[PDB]
Amino acid sequence: STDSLSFSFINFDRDERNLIFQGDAHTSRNNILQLTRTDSNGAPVRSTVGRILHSAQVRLWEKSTNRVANLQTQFSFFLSSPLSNPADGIAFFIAPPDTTIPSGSAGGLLGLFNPRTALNESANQVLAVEFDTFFAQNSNTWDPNYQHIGIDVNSIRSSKVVRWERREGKTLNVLVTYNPSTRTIDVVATYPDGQRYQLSHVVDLTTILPEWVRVGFSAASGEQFQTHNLESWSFTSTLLY
Amino acid sequence: STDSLSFSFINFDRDERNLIFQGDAHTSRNNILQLTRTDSNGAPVRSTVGRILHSAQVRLWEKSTNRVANLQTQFSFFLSSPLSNPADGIAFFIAPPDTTIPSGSAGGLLGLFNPRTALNESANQVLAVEFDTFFAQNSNTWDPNYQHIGIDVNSIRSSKVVRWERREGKTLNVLVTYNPSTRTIDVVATYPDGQRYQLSHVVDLTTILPEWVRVGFSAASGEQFQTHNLESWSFTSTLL
Ligand SMILES: CC(=O)N[C@@H]1[C@@H](O)[C@H](O[C@@H]2O[C@H](CO)[C@@H](O[C@@H]3O[C@H](CO[C@H]4O[C@H](CO)[C@@H](O)[C@H](O)[C@@H]4O[C@@H]4O[C@H](CO)[C@@H](O)[C@H](O)[C@H]4NC(C)=O)[C@@H](O)[C@H](O[C@H]4O[C@H](CO)[C@@H](O)[C@H](O)[C@@H]4O[C@@H]4O[C@H](CO)[C@@H](O)[C@H](O)[C@H]4NC(C)=O)[C@@H]3O)[C@H](O)[C@H]2NC(C)=O)[C@@H](CO)O[C@H]1NC(=O)C[C@H](N)C(=O)O
Ligand SMILES: [Ca+2]
Ligand SMILES: [Ca+2]
Ligand SMILES: [Mn+2]
Ligand SMILES: [Mn+2]
């Protein structure tokens, strides 16, 4: 009785037919999705980007009946690094279906933006929820001066941020929703001990993205590095109104 | 949580990016999916096959672990025709991801089989649930002598059938499930007045289909014809 699409992964098998793997994204022998490159011992390496998109296209709206999609997605990730200042982060993102890794998008651009246009909203079509671990003010000039979760609308400079603490190796469980009635992106992220982070932003997704999109994850490292380990992912979209 | 995939169409838009259209399959201005060919006034015509598959592949089973999927799908369709003996039928089906319309598959082969291998189980990889309106024993030599619902396992000759009544322009609502614990396909179908049909068959899908499959619908006409109009479709599969 609705138009809808849903999928869930509890781990990531070696030859997954419904995922589009980009750049350095790969799977580990224990079915964890590794977004960024590792060496032969599984250690993270510099200057790497990897992404995945689900192959099923999501319809963001349907005009003739004035419907717009809601969206709900849950995912779990952890990060590992020997460094004091591990980098760069992982993001959930929504983009056109033919989206590809931009040139120059490693480091603090998180695999999402070209350096030429990273701060230029008119040149991009992307909504991302970022988990940003590296904020050095002399390179990541757009960042607040702390680790943070952000909502990114056509730019690596987030519209809203909240202070966040990276915890070496610990799973962060995230819920992201879009409510088309209030035009609100809501983010809730919780560590296993119950420590919670919340962030929201009003953005009408129909004004920034095309009718059909793909959804997925991106991660990068620059001169500093970490593994970006995606453990599980569920997603649902329903046309409403 | 689980490894699962679900989708639902309450009707069909002119633009549906996650469907693979094969042969004569197309959408109507009224957001109905029309499987078989029509003329310029929307009247059905002879000798036509159309199919749709969802673009998302379904993991039916995993060889390394022996995990197997359950499946549930619900759909609704209606048929229309000027003919006293309209033909040939519509089927839900499950097949390998690269499945295409076989040559010679119009008429009573429902877009699913080639004439030389339609009864050779070793040559096919398909599970279908057919809604068969044309049973002439002199051409459809594999059919029971009445309209019927059938469960087809690598053959156009159904493994099980139940008598069924075609109703011009009326919607049949259908549920098809696969239960991997009992290895049973079950089918329940109803018309708007409550008239009910049920059929089941025990078949281990892991014996007839590869690990990754696609799902969708096929329909055909031969010398006799009708439109095959898919109104809605929902699907869910979970790998246990
Ligand atoms: C010389 C000699 O005697 N040779 C013998 C051969 O003639 C025998 O061949 C068989 O003859 C049968 C009788 O004529 C044929 O049955 C008829 O087949 C018609 C065509 O079937 C099509 O269309 C069907 C409907 O859509 C579809 O279900 C079929 O599957 C088939 O479509 C094929 O399918 C193929 C896959 O299998 C596919 O590759 C093809 O692409 C596809 N074709 C197309 C174009 O897409 C069928 O229409 C006939 O049905 C009508 O007639 C029966 C009564 O006979 C009625 O019960 C039906 O309701 C229907 O009636 C019609 O309905 C209309 C609509 O309401 C109405 O307008 C009409 O007025 C009414 N017509 C009538 C007559 O009432 C029917 O089933 C059969 O197809 C032939 N088989 C083959 C393989 O060609 C042959 C085998 O029996 O045997 C020969 N005899 C000998 O060899 C003896 C001796 N050794 C010798 O002489 O040599
Ligand atoms: Ca940063
Ligand atoms: Ca038949
Ligand atoms: Mn940031
Ligand atoms: Mn039959």
Summary tags:
homodimer; 241 residues; mainly beta; Jelly Rolls; 9-stranded antiparallel beta sheet; 8-stranded antiparallel beta sheet; 17 strands; binds a molecule of 8 linked components (NAG-NAG-BMA-MAN-NAG-MAN-NAG-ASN); binds calcium ion; binds manganese (II) ion
Describe this structure in words.
It is classed as sugar binding protein. The entry lists the keywords sugar binding protein, N-glycan, plant lectin. It forms a dimeric assembly. Structure of the lectin from Platypodium elegans in complex with heptasaccharide. The structure is a homodimer. Chain A is mainly β and 241 residues long. Chain A is built from no helices and 17 strands. In chain A, strands 1, 3, 4, 7, 8, 13, 14, 15 and 17 form a 9-stranded antiparallel β-sheet that branches. In chain A, strands 2, 5, 6, 9, 10, 11, 12 and 16 form an 8-stranded antiparallel β-sheet that branches. Chains A and B meet through strand 1 of A and strand 1 of B. Strand 1 of chain A pairs antiparallel with strand 1 (3-9) of chain B, so a sheet runs across the interface. Bound molecules: a molecule of 8 linked components (NAG-NAG-BMA-MAN-NAG-MAN-NAG-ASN), calcium ion (2 copies) and manganese (II) ion (MN) (2 copies). Residues 130, 132, 143, 148, 150, 158 of chain B line the site of one manganese (II) ion (MN).
